[PDB]
mmCIF file of C-alpha atoms and ligand atoms in Angstrom:
data_model
loop_
_atom_site.group_PDB
_atom_site.id
_atom_site.type_symbol
_atom_site.label_atom_id
_atom_site.label_comp_id
_atom_site.label_asym_id
_atom_site.label_seq_id
_atom_site.Cartn_x
_atom_site.Cartn_y
_atom_site.Cartn_z
ATOM 1 C CA UNK W 1 77.368 203.875 127.480
ATOM 2 C CA UNK W 2 74.433 201.444 126.773
ATOM 3 C CA UNK W 3 71.386 202.531 124.751
ATOM 4 C CA UNK W 4 69.491 201.934 128.490
ATOM 5 C CA UNK W 5 71.385 204.417 130.277
ATOM 6 C CA UNK W 6 71.299 207.358 127.457
ATOM 7 C CA UNK W 7 68.473 209.231 126.528
ATOM 8 C CA UNK W 8 66.770 208.313 123.408
ATOM 9 C CA UNK W 9 65.678 210.964 120.640
ATOM 10 C CA UNK W 10 62.116 209.598 119.233
ATOM 11 C CA UNK W 11 62.322 211.253 115.678
ATOM 12 C CA UNK W 12 58.943 210.611 114.951
ATOM 13 C CA UNK W 13 57.891 211.598 110.925
ATOM 14 C CA UNK W 14 61.852 212.075 110.310
ATOM 15 C CA UNK W 15 62.385 210.714 107.207
ATOM 16 C CA UNK W 16 65.936 208.375 106.566
ATOM 17 C CA UNK W 17 67.918 211.334 104.642
ATOM 18 C CA UNK W 18 66.757 213.899 107.145
ATOM 19 C CA UNK W 19 67.681 211.863 109.917
ATOM 20 C CA UNK W 20 71.352 211.156 107.958
ATOM 21 C CA UNK W 21 71.616 214.738 107.650
ATOM 22 C CA UNK W 22 71.025 215.898 111.090
ATOM 23 C CA UNK W 23 72.901 213.287 112.885
ATOM 24 C CA UNK W 24 76.070 215.546 113.939
ATOM 25 C CA UNK W 25 73.482 217.529 115.570
ATOM 26 C CA UNK W 26 71.438 214.440 117.045
ATOM 27 C CA UNK W 27 74.992 213.478 118.822
ATOM 28 C CA UNK W 28 76.330 216.547 119.669
ATOM 29 C CA UNK W 29 72.917 216.885 121.574
ATOM 30 C CA UNK W 30 73.477 214.525 124.001
ATOM 31 C CA UNK W 31 70.997 211.268 122.560
ATOM 32 C CA UNK W 32 72.637 207.978 122.790
ATOM 33 C CA UNK W 33 70.015 206.472 120.337
ATOM 34 C CA UNK W 34 67.042 207.370 118.067
ATOM 35 C CA UNK W 35 63.471 206.041 117.392
ATOM 36 C CA UNK W 36 62.406 206.209 113.650
ATOM 37 C CA UNK W 37 58.859 206.072 113.107
ATOM 38 C CA UNK W 38 57.730 202.478 111.083
ATOM 39 C CA UNK W 39 59.818 201.711 108.299
ATOM 40 C CA UNK W 40 57.838 198.513 106.994
ATOM 41 C CA UNK W 41 55.439 199.240 103.958
ATOM 42 C CA UNK W 42 51.911 200.522 104.345
ATOM 43 C CA UNK W 43 49.208 201.119 103.044
ATOM 44 C CA UNK W 44 49.599 205.104 102.041
ATOM 45 C CA UNK W 45 46.182 206.579 102.770
ATOM 46 C CA UNK W 46 44.230 209.866 101.593
ATOM 47 C CA UNK W 47 46.609 210.034 98.222
ATOM 48 C CA UNK W 48 49.693 209.675 100.672
ATOM 49 C CA UNK W 49 49.427 213.250 100.983
ATOM 50 C CA UNK W 50 52.449 214.384 103.544
ATOM 51 C CA UNK W 51 50.110 216.550 105.589
ATOM 52 C CA UNK W 52 51.329 216.316 109.555
ATOM 53 C CA UNK W 53 47.623 214.944 110.175
ATOM 54 C CA UNK W 54 48.373 212.441 108.252
ATOM 55 C CA UNK W 55 51.259 210.378 110.830
ATOM 56 C CA UNK W 56 48.828 207.404 111.493
ATOM 57 C CA UNK W 57 48.735 205.843 107.882
ATOM 58 C CA UNK W 58 52.567 204.753 109.468
ATOM 59 C CA UNK W 59 50.935 202.060 111.670
ATOM 60 C CA UNK W 60 49.129 200.386 108.872
ATOM 61 C CA UNK W 61 51.434 197.856 107.775
ATOM 62 C CA UNK W 62 50.895 195.910 103.921
ATOM 63 C CA UNK W 63 53.684 193.840 104.121
ATOM 64 C CA UNK W 64 57.200 193.836 105.577
ATOM 65 C CA UNK W 65 59.230 194.751 103.169
ATOM 66 C CA UNK W 66 61.796 197.505 104.387
ATOM 67 C CA UNK W 67 60.818 201.554 102.390
ATOM 68 C CA UNK W 68 57.813 204.039 102.162
ATOM 69 C CA UNK W 69 56.947 207.133 100.866
ATOM 70 C CA UNK W 70 56.911 208.937 104.246
ATOM 71 C CA UNK W 71 60.545 207.742 105.332
ATOM 72 C CA UNK W 72 62.345 206.820 102.345
ATOM 73 C CA UNK W 73 63.575 203.428 100.868
ATOM 74 C CA UNK W 74 65.703 200.042 102.734
ATOM 75 C CA UNK W 75 68.963 201.790 101.041
ATOM 76 C CA UNK W 76 68.311 205.225 103.136
ATOM 77 C CA UNK W 77 67.865 203.275 105.757
ATOM 78 C CA UNK W 78 70.518 201.562 106.096
ATOM 79 C CA UNK W 79 73.309 205.067 105.050
ATOM 80 C CA UNK W 80 71.215 206.471 107.762
ATOM 81 C CA UNK W 81 72.314 203.545 110.608
ATOM 82 C CA UNK W 82 75.717 203.853 109.373
ATOM 83 C CA UNK W 83 76.064 207.929 109.567
ATOM 84 C CA UNK W 84 74.345 207.172 113.198
ATOM 85 C CA UNK W 85 76.923 204.359 113.847
ATOM 86 C CA UNK W 86 79.912 206.989 112.804
ATOM 87 C CA UNK W 87 78.717 208.827 115.674
ATOM 88 C CA UNK W 88 78.291 206.400 117.720
ATOM 89 C CA UNK W 89 74.522 206.498 117.565
ATOM 90 C CA UNK W 90 72.510 203.683 117.956
ATOM 91 C CA UNK W 91 69.062 203.216 115.975
ATOM 92 C CA UNK W 92 66.072 201.550 117.558
ATOM 93 C CA UNK W 93 63.041 200.695 114.978
ATOM 94 C CA UNK W 94 59.335 201.149 115.365
ATOM 95 C CA UNK W 95 58.089 197.455 114.679
ATOM 96 C CA UNK W 96 54.028 197.649 114.260
ATOM 97 C CA UNK W 97 54.333 193.452 114.454
ATOM 98 C CA UNK W 98 50.342 193.193 116.395
ATOM 99 C CA UNK W 99 48.481 193.780 113.196
ATOM 100 C CA UNK W 100 48.226 195.052 109.185
ATOM 101 C CA UNK W 101 45.874 197.951 107.704
ATOM 102 C CA UNK W 102 42.556 197.354 108.453
ATOM 103 C CA UNK W 103 41.831 197.315 104.472
ATOM 104 C CA UNK W 104 41.737 194.316 103.272
ATOM 105 C CA UNK W 105 42.240 194.945 99.680
ATOM 106 C CA UNK W 106 45.931 197.023 100.298
ATOM 107 C CA UNK W 107 47.502 194.338 102.105
ATOM 108 C CA UNK W 108 50.246 192.649 100.159
ATOM 109 C CA UNK W 109 49.712 189.033 98.607
ATOM 110 C CA UNK W 110 53.123 188.435 100.546
ATOM 111 C CA UNK W 111 50.878 188.487 103.571
ATOM 112 C CA UNK W 112 48.138 186.712 102.102
ATOM 113 C CA UNK W 113 50.622 184.138 101.036
ATOM 114 C CA UNK W 114 50.733 182.899 104.574
ATOM 115 C CA UNK W 115 48.036 180.292 105.419
ATOM 116 C CA UNK W 116 45.835 180.821 108.446
ATOM 117 C CA UNK W 117 47.595 184.484 108.839
ATOM 118 C CA UNK W 118 45.157 186.462 110.738
ATOM 119 C CA UNK W 119 42.679 186.577 113.859
ATOM 120 C CA UNK W 120 40.601 188.873 111.722
ATOM 121 C CA UNK W 121 39.115 192.932 112.260
ATOM 122 C CA UNK W 122 36.675 191.520 115.065
ATOM 123 C CA UNK W 123 37.248 195.130 116.985
ATOM 124 C CA UNK W 124 38.457 194.499 120.405
ATOM 125 C CA UNK W 125 35.185 195.186 123.281
ATOM 126 C CA UNK W 126 36.520 194.043 126.295
ATOM 127 C CA UNK W 127 39.263 196.086 128.216
ATOM 128 C CA UNK W 128 39.679 193.712 130.901
ATOM 129 C CA UNK W 129 39.779 190.468 129.384
ATOM 130 C CA UNK W 130 43.276 189.160 128.045
ATOM 131 C CA UNK W 131 41.431 187.302 125.388
ATOM 132 C CA UNK W 132 39.891 190.168 123.578
ATOM 133 C CA UNK W 133 42.788 192.347 123.859
ATOM 134 C CA UNK W 134 45.111 189.787 122.274
ATOM 135 C CA UNK W 135 43.016 187.542 120.043
ATOM 136 C CA UNK W 136 40.866 190.351 118.310
ATOM 137 C CA UNK W 137 41.474 193.384 116.524
ATOM 138 C CA UNK W 138 42.723 197.261 117.636
ATOM 139 C CA UNK W 139 40.769 199.571 115.251
ATOM 140 C CA UNK W 140 39.787 197.281 113.206
ATOM 141 C CA UNK W 141 43.429 196.553 112.260
ATOM 142 C CA UNK W 142 43.471 193.192 111.227
ATOM 143 C CA UNK W 143 45.023 191.214 113.792
ATOM 144 C CA UNK W 144 48.315 188.674 113.277
ATOM 145 C CA UNK W 145 47.718 184.609 114.445
ATOM 146 C CA UNK W 146 50.504 185.168 116.484
ATOM 147 C CA UNK W 147 50.385 181.366 117.671
ATOM 148 C CA UNK W 148 51.038 180.809 113.620
ATOM 149 C CA UNK W 149 54.568 179.360 114.091
ATOM 150 C CA UNK W 150 54.667 180.533 110.175
ATOM 151 C CA UNK W 151 53.884 184.014 110.663
ATOM 152 C CA UNK W 152 56.016 184.214 113.973
ATOM 153 C CA UNK W 153 59.117 183.581 111.260
ATOM 154 C CA UNK W 154 58.186 186.204 108.868
ATOM 155 C CA UNK W 155 58.202 189.092 111.156
ATOM 156 C CA UNK W 156 61.068 187.926 113.139
ATOM 157 C CA UNK W 157 62.097 187.532 109.538
ATOM 158 C CA UNK W 158 61.886 191.267 109.698
ATOM 159 C CA UNK W 159 63.332 192.129 112.996
ATOM 160 C CA UNK W 160 66.136 190.080 111.779
ATOM 161 C CA UNK W 161 66.341 192.135 108.090
ATOM 162 C CA UNK W 162 66.404 195.719 110.123
ATOM 163 C CA UNK W 163 69.140 194.484 112.086
ATOM 164 C CA UNK W 164 70.940 193.507 109.214
ATOM 165 C CA UNK W 165 70.560 196.738 107.931
ATOM 166 C CA UNK W 166 71.970 198.424 110.996
ATOM 167 C CA UNK W 167 68.745 198.623 113.436
ATOM 168 C CA UNK W 168 70.003 198.272 117.006
ATOM 169 C CA UNK W 169 66.985 197.511 118.894
ATOM 170 C CA UNK W 170 63.338 197.669 118.526
ATOM 171 C CA UNK W 171 59.905 199.684 120.046
ATOM 172 C CA UNK W 172 57.180 196.636 120.080
ATOM 173 C CA UNK W 173 54.069 199.307 118.598
ATOM 174 C CA UNK W 174 50.568 198.120 120.712
ATOM 175 C CA UNK W 175 53.120 195.156 122.117
ATOM 176 C CA UNK W 176 50.384 194.437 125.185
ATOM 177 C CA UNK W 177 48.309 193.053 122.312
ATOM 178 C CA UNK W 178 50.202 189.816 121.668
ATOM 179 C CA UNK W 179 49.231 187.131 124.210
ATOM 180 C CA UNK W 180 52.526 185.774 126.185
ATOM 181 C CA UNK W 181 53.659 182.590 127.313
ATOM 182 C CA UNK W 182 51.279 182.287 130.316
ATOM 183 C CA UNK W 183 48.084 184.177 129.233
ATOM 184 C CA UNK W 184 45.518 180.964 129.590
ATOM 185 C CA UNK W 185 45.453 178.294 126.429
ATOM 186 C CA UNK W 186 45.501 180.735 123.980
ATOM 187 C CA UNK W 187 49.488 181.633 124.537
ATOM 188 C CA UNK W 188 52.117 181.529 122.487
ATOM 189 C CA UNK W 189 55.810 181.718 122.291
ATOM 190 C CA UNK W 190 55.695 184.818 119.732
ATOM 191 C CA UNK W 191 57.670 187.339 122.596
ATOM 192 C CA UNK W 192 60.081 184.271 123.522
ATOM 193 C CA UNK W 193 60.975 183.587 120.203
ATOM 194 C CA UNK W 194 61.162 187.327 118.376
ATOM 195 C CA UNK W 195 62.789 188.877 121.267
ATOM 196 C CA UNK W 196 65.684 186.260 120.696
ATOM 197 C CA UNK W 197 67.608 188.755 117.878
ATOM 198 C CA UNK W 198 70.891 189.813 118.479
ATOM 199 C CA UNK W 199 68.904 193.210 118.970
ATOM 200 C CA UNK W 200 71.258 195.669 121.834
ATOM 201 C CA UNK W 201 67.782 197.070 123.670
ATOM 202 C CA UNK W 202 64.184 196.728 122.880
ATOM 203 C CA UNK W 203 60.747 197.468 124.495
ATOM 204 C CA UNK W 204 56.854 197.575 124.122
ATOM 205 C CA UNK W 205 54.300 199.902 124.197
ATOM 206 C CA UNK W 206 52.442 199.288 126.602
ATOM 207 C CA UNK W 207 49.706 201.135 128.172
ATOM 208 C CA UNK W 208 48.889 200.608 131.302
ATOM 209 C CA UNK W 209 45.524 199.757 132.475
ATOM 210 C CA UNK W 210 43.917 196.844 134.716
ATOM 211 C CA UNK W 211 44.840 194.298 132.520
ATOM 212 C CA UNK W 212 48.037 195.271 130.857
ATOM 213 C CA UNK W 213 50.653 192.782 133.263
ATOM 214 C CA UNK W 214 53.201 195.215 132.818
ATOM 215 C CA UNK W 215 55.841 193.719 135.332
ATOM 216 C CA UNK W 216 54.754 190.247 133.160
ATOM 217 C CA UNK W 217 56.301 191.733 129.769
ATOM 218 C CA UNK W 218 59.094 193.647 131.325
ATOM 219 C CA UNK W 219 60.535 190.063 131.965
ATOM 220 C CA UNK W 220 60.813 189.980 127.905
ATOM 221 C CA UNK W 221 61.399 193.894 127.105
ATOM 222 C CA UNK W 222 61.151 197.268 128.758
ATOM 223 C CA UNK W 223 58.364 199.306 129.116
ATOM 224 C CA UNK W 224 56.616 202.230 128.983
ATOM 225 C CA UNK W 225 55.606 204.317 132.357
ATOM 226 C CA UNK W 226 52.135 205.571 130.336
ATOM 227 C CA UNK W 227 50.919 206.632 134.029
ATOM 228 C CA UNK W 228 54.331 208.405 134.873
ATOM 229 C CA UNK W 229 53.704 210.294 131.980
ATOM 230 C CA UNK W 230 50.335 211.601 133.162
ATOM 231 C CA UNK W 231 51.677 212.883 136.943
ATOM 232 C CA UNK W 232 54.145 214.316 134.984
ATOM 233 C CA UNK W 233 51.609 216.333 133.145
ATOM 234 C CA UNK W 234 49.565 217.008 136.037
ATOM 235 C CA UNK W 235 52.629 218.640 137.532
ATOM 236 C CA UNK W 236 53.261 221.006 134.475
ATOM 237 C CA UNK W 237 49.602 221.626 134.473
ATOM 238 C CA UNK W 238 49.181 222.995 137.404
ATOM 239 C CA UNK W 239 52.990 224.213 138.115
ATOM 240 C CA UNK W 240 53.390 222.022 141.023
ATOM 241 C CA UNK W 241 56.610 219.594 141.267
ATOM 242 C CA UNK W 242 55.877 218.230 144.568
ATOM 243 C CA UNK W 243 58.140 215.263 144.652
ATOM 244 C CA UNK W 244 55.449 213.042 146.682
ATOM 245 C CA UNK W 245 53.479 212.960 142.929
ATOM 246 C CA UNK W 246 56.002 212.930 140.587
ATOM 247 C CA UNK W 247 58.986 210.138 142.544
ATOM 248 C CA UNK W 248 56.833 207.406 141.814
ATOM 249 C CA UNK W 249 56.791 205.513 138.722
ATOM 250 C CA UNK W 250 52.917 204.341 139.134
ATOM 251 C CA UNK W 251 54.217 201.212 138.325
ATOM 252 C CA UNK W 252 54.933 197.635 139.275
ATOM 253 C CA UNK W 253 57.950 197.688 137.280
ATOM 254 C CA UNK W 254 61.100 199.358 138.195
ATOM 255 C CA UNK W 255 63.497 201.749 137.237
ATOM 256 C CA UNK W 256 66.010 199.974 135.391
ATOM 257 C CA UNK W 257 63.121 198.104 133.114
ATOM 258 C CA UNK W 258 61.296 201.127 132.254
ATOM 259 C CA UNK W 259 61.089 203.864 129.461
ATOM 260 C CA UNK W 260 59.696 207.494 130.046
ATOM 261 C CA UNK W 261 58.282 210.164 128.510
ATOM 262 C CA UNK W 262 56.553 213.803 129.413
ATOM 263 C CA UNK W 263 53.859 212.899 126.654
ATOM 264 C CA UNK W 264 54.067 210.296 123.621
ATOM 265 C CA UNK W 265 53.426 211.188 120.176
ATOM 266 C CA UNK W 266 50.044 209.558 121.000
ATOM 267 C CA UNK W 267 49.201 211.433 123.491
ATOM 268 C CA UNK W 268 50.266 214.520 121.153
ATOM 269 C CA UNK W 269 48.726 213.730 117.599
ATOM 270 C CA UNK W 270 45.645 212.069 118.219
ATOM 271 C CA UNK W 271 42.412 213.936 118.224
ATOM 272 C CA UNK W 272 42.211 214.010 121.873
ATOM 273 C CA UNK W 273 44.824 216.392 122.123
ATOM 274 C CA UNK W 274 45.543 215.397 125.641
ATOM 275 C CA UNK W 275 49.537 216.476 125.874
ATOM 276 C CA UNK W 276 49.207 219.146 122.605
ATOM 277 C CA UNK W 277 48.484 221.979 124.877
ATOM 278 C CA UNK W 278 52.123 222.090 126.795
ATOM 279 C CA UNK W 279 54.723 224.962 125.347
ATOM 280 C CA UNK W 280 58.046 224.609 125.772
ATOM 281 C CA UNK W 281 59.027 225.546 128.728
ATOM 282 C CA UNK W 282 56.960 222.929 130.201
ATOM 283 C CA UNK W 283 58.744 220.265 128.179
ATOM 284 C CA UNK W 284 62.060 222.169 129.529
ATOM 285 C CA UNK W 285 61.104 221.190 132.592
ATOM 286 C CA UNK W 286 58.967 217.772 132.491
ATOM 287 C CA UNK W 287 62.457 216.411 130.760
ATOM 288 C CA UNK W 288 64.573 218.156 133.016
ATOM 289 C CA UNK W 289 62.598 215.886 135.874
ATOM 290 C CA UNK W 290 62.297 212.430 133.863
ATOM 291 C CA UNK W 291 65.938 212.953 132.614
ATOM 292 C CA UNK W 292 67.429 213.576 135.767
ATOM 293 C CA UNK W 293 66.054 210.043 136.915
ATOM 294 C CA UNK W 294 68.388 207.279 137.562
ATOM 295 C CA UNK W 295 67.653 204.085 135.745
ATOM 296 C CA UNK W 296 64.807 204.838 133.878
ATOM 297 C CA UNK W 297 65.309 205.492 129.817
ATOM 298 C CA UNK W 298 63.408 209.282 129.231
ATOM 299 C CA UNK W 299 62.064 209.346 125.194
ATOM 300 C CA UNK W 300 62.379 213.172 124.087
ATOM 301 C CA UNK W 301 59.344 213.499 121.447
ATOM 302 C CA UNK W 302 60.069 215.854 118.422
ATOM 303 C CA UNK W 303 56.959 217.699 118.303
ATOM 304 C CA UNK W 304 56.160 219.149 114.271
ATOM 305 C CA UNK W 305 57.653 222.394 113.796
ATOM 306 C CA UNK W 306 55.632 225.341 115.211
ATOM 307 C CA UNK W 307 53.632 222.572 116.769
ATOM 308 C CA UNK W 308 52.258 222.758 120.599
ATOM 309 C CA UNK W 309 50.085 225.315 123.079
ATOM 310 C CA UNK W 310 46.958 223.256 121.622
ATOM 311 C CA UNK W 311 47.873 223.449 118.008
ATOM 312 C CA UNK W 312 48.375 220.172 116.667
ATOM 313 C CA UNK W 313 49.648 220.681 113.126
ATOM 314 C CA UNK W 314 50.014 224.043 112.150
ATOM 315 C CA UNK W 315 51.534 223.127 108.528
ATOM 316 C CA UNK W 316 54.378 224.616 108.963
ATOM 317 C CA UNK W 317 56.222 221.452 107.825
ATOM 318 C CA UNK W 318 55.062 217.758 106.821
ATOM 319 C CA UNK W 319 56.337 214.211 107.266
ATOM 320 C CA UNK W 320 59.567 213.627 106.685
ATOM 321 C CA UNK W 321 61.115 217.023 107.475
ATOM 322 C CA UNK W 322 63.101 217.630 110.802
ATOM 323 C CA UNK W 323 60.565 218.700 113.927
ATOM 324 C CA UNK W 324 61.210 221.145 115.641
ATOM 325 C CA UNK W 325 64.504 222.719 116.944
ATOM 326 C CA UNK W 326 63.705 222.153 120.669
ATOM 327 C CA UNK W 327 65.463 218.814 120.511
ATOM 328 C CA UNK W 328 68.256 220.082 120.355
ATOM 329 C CA UNK W 329 67.712 223.225 123.421
ATOM 330 C CA UNK W 330 70.529 224.437 125.563
ATOM 331 C CA UNK W 331 67.925 223.279 128.706
ATOM 332 C CA UNK W 332 67.357 220.000 126.539
ATOM 333 C CA UNK W 333 70.608 218.492 125.888
ATOM 334 C CA UNK W 334 72.374 220.061 129.634
ATOM 335 C CA UNK W 335 69.826 217.679 130.735
ATOM 336 C CA UNK W 336 70.558 214.726 128.364
ATOM 337 C CA UNK W 337 74.874 215.260 129.068
ATOM 338 C CA UNK W 338 73.382 215.620 133.099
ATOM 339 C CA UNK W 339 71.817 212.179 132.169
ATOM 340 C CA UNK W 340 75.150 210.539 130.691
ATOM 341 C CA UNK W 341 77.365 211.683 133.202
ATOM 342 C CA UNK W 342 75.382 210.439 136.678
ATOM 343 C CA UNK W 343 74.842 206.789 135.344
ATOM 344 C CA UNK W 344 75.147 204.941 137.776
ATOM 345 C CA UNK W 345 74.352 207.499 140.745
ATOM 346 C CA UNK W 346 71.588 207.354 143.336
ATOM 347 C CA UNK W 347 68.924 209.840 143.464
ATOM 348 C CA UNK W 348 67.273 211.868 145.399
ATOM 349 C CA UNK W 349 64.598 214.147 145.094
ATOM 350 C CA UNK W 350 63.046 217.438 146.753
ATOM 351 C CA UNK W 351 61.747 220.511 146.739
ATOM 352 C CA UNK W 352 63.492 223.160 148.274
ATOM 353 C CA UNK W 353 62.224 225.581 150.805
ATOM 354 C CA UNK W 354 59.382 223.381 150.694
ATOM 355 C CA UNK W 355 57.968 224.553 147.551
ATOM 356 C CA UNK W 356 56.925 222.209 145.621
ATOM 357 C CA UNK W 357 56.879 224.954 142.446
ATOM 358 C CA UNK W 358 60.832 223.702 142.982
ATOM 359 C CA UNK W 359 62.232 219.962 142.236
ATOM 360 C CA UNK W 360 65.814 219.470 142.422
ATOM 361 C CA UNK W 361 67.571 216.099 141.921
ATOM 362 C CA UNK W 362 70.694 215.431 143.817
ATOM 363 C CA UNK W 363 72.227 212.124 141.919
ATOM 364 C CA UNK W 364 75.325 211.218 144.476
ATOM 365 C CA UNK W 365 77.627 214.148 145.813
ATOM 366 C CA UNK W 366 78.607 214.941 141.822
ATOM 367 C CA UNK W 367 75.472 216.955 140.012
ATOM 368 C CA UNK W 368 72.037 218.219 141.016
ATOM 369 C CA UNK W 369 69.224 219.423 138.122
ATOM 370 C CA UNK W 370 66.533 222.009 139.289
ATOM 371 C CA UNK W 371 63.483 222.513 137.831
ATOM 372 C CA UNK W 372 61.386 226.245 138.721
ATOM 373 C CA UNK W 373 57.686 226.034 137.386
ATOM 374 C CA UNK W 374 57.042 229.300 138.970
ATOM 375 C CA UNK W 375 56.327 232.539 137.143
ATOM 376 C CA UNK W 376 58.351 233.713 139.534
ATOM 377 C CA UNK W 377 62.538 233.539 139.996
ATOM 378 C CA UNK W 378 63.766 231.649 143.237
ATOM 379 C CA UNK W 379 66.796 232.533 145.301
ATOM 380 C CA UNK W 380 67.317 229.137 146.349
ATOM 381 C CA UNK W 381 69.540 228.159 149.844
ATOM 382 C CA UNK W 382 69.099 224.490 150.518
ATOM 383 C CA UNK W 383 71.761 221.443 151.443
ATOM 384 C CA UNK W 384 73.844 219.816 148.805
ATOM 385 C CA UNK W 385 76.590 217.328 148.675
ATOM 386 C CA UNK W 386 78.331 219.081 146.046
ATOM 387 C CA UNK W 387 81.745 219.951 146.862
ATOM 388 C CA UNK W 388 81.727 224.004 147.777
ATOM 389 C CA UNK W 389 82.769 226.242 144.574
ATOM 390 C CA UNK W 390 80.702 228.226 142.197
ATOM 391 C CA UNK W 391 78.783 226.394 139.318
ATOM 392 C CA UNK W 392 76.979 227.938 136.117
ATOM 393 C CA UNK W 393 73.987 226.885 135.210
ATOM 394 C CA UNK W 394 74.666 224.542 132.224
ATOM 395 C CA UNK W 395 71.282 224.352 130.733
ATOM 396 C CA UNK W 396 70.940 228.697 130.598
ATOM 397 C CA UNK W 397 72.090 232.126 132.003
ATOM 398 C CA UNK W 398 73.505 232.451 135.575
ATOM 399 C CA UNK W 399 75.461 231.130 138.496
ATOM 400 C CA UNK W 400 75.191 229.619 141.996
ATOM 401 C CA UNK W 401 77.471 228.903 144.924
ATOM 402 C CA UNK W 402 78.069 226.140 146.937
ATOM 403 C CA UNK W 403 79.517 227.052 150.636
ATOM 404 C CA UNK W 404 79.788 224.962 153.557
ATOM 405 C CA UNK W 405 77.194 222.187 152.190
ATOM 406 C CA UNK W 406 74.981 225.391 150.940
ATOM 407 C CA UNK W 407 73.277 225.644 147.605
ATOM 408 C CA UNK W 408 72.702 228.931 146.665
ATOM 409 C CA UNK W 409 71.786 231.068 144.015
ATOM 410 C CA UNK W 410 69.173 232.117 141.883
ATOM 411 C CA UNK W 411 66.205 229.933 139.980
ATOM 412 C CA UNK W 412 65.340 232.312 137.025
ATOM 413 C CA UNK W 413 60.905 231.582 136.009
ATOM 414 C CA UNK W 414 60.189 228.908 134.554
ATOM 415 C CA UNK W 415 63.997 228.082 134.049
ATOM 416 C CA UNK W 416 65.524 224.263 134.354
ATOM 417 C CA UNK W 417 69.359 224.967 136.300
ATOM 418 C CA UNK W 418 72.147 221.858 135.334
ATOM 419 C CA UNK W 419 75.117 221.973 138.559
ATOM 420 C CA UNK W 420 77.897 219.817 138.508
ATOM 421 C CA UNK W 421 81.827 219.404 138.208
ATOM 422 C CA UNK W 422 83.931 219.628 135.103
HETATM 423 CA CA1 CA Y 501 46.759 190.529 118.909
HETATM 424 CA CA1 CA Y 502 73.476 200.218 114.071
HETATM 425 CA CA1 CA Y 503 44.131 221.459 118.259
#
């Protein structure tokens, strides 16, 4: 299938060499593509220390040469993309092209060689003013002068290089901070131009608000369903998976142009710790919900080894090392495969017997996914289109039966279920 049809593994902070070595496992996990952290040169602050708390330096470019101390060299990136292809895995690169580091003295002469390359570092003030949001600085990070056709070619050359090194797609960091052709009199052809590459798949991080212009960006790339992420999280928090709150994407953009998640690296690693509270079960459950969906493209966030239950960085690994083994959890991968096999099937979300603690998604008449957010097991008995027969839970222990259109079986507490003919 295409990248848009499958699931994506966010290999957050995974070095190029780490990725290359876990490639067979990534494949067996049912992922169609992996997303790396920024691969360009950055300001390796705090003396380049690899403590997981230093994750943010990767978002402070100093040049657009490929390679850095956190992820590895440009050669290792290439080898990584090659090892990925040996398994049909696509590679999506996190492109930070809206800004550079805040430290002007760290910026490379290479960048400074570009005449009038920056809008300055005047921090945004009015997040309701498309002018201030796009033309000024985010957190003090020098804002690229994207209206300058010369910066465009410099940045696009970087993207083209990545594609030549084996990259297959992009994730445009802070995409909401780069003007569109119709943003008043300060608009540019930045997006029309840079999205014109051989990239197979590309989406932009556009966190939603009154001025994010979600639908506008969708014309040039897929977009993030940030609101939906909060909808899911709230559901997980209250152990209430009622479909009246988690079926709508809370966005004007339709599923087919949406990239979804249970949590993002931002909601997890920032000092706000807004999603850090979740446990692995909360993730197995949330992932069952979003990854069972039709159209949208789910992004699985790989957490730091030992991370969760409110603790961001427990110190059991550092930047570069692989994340926890949840990305290849039986429940998680079973759902990945379900997502892949059902591609093209319609969907039907519900809450069996009116119990909102039970999520159910029936895709066409080929497969069903159940999610029990409650702390007690539930003997299900609901309508289904699956052909009569016995179905072993692919996501875990247990089995179910389908007789005369009746789906019966027990779904353990805090558990996921995935059923469909072999
Ligand atoms: Ca900008
Ligand atoms: Ca490739
Ligand atoms: Ca904490």
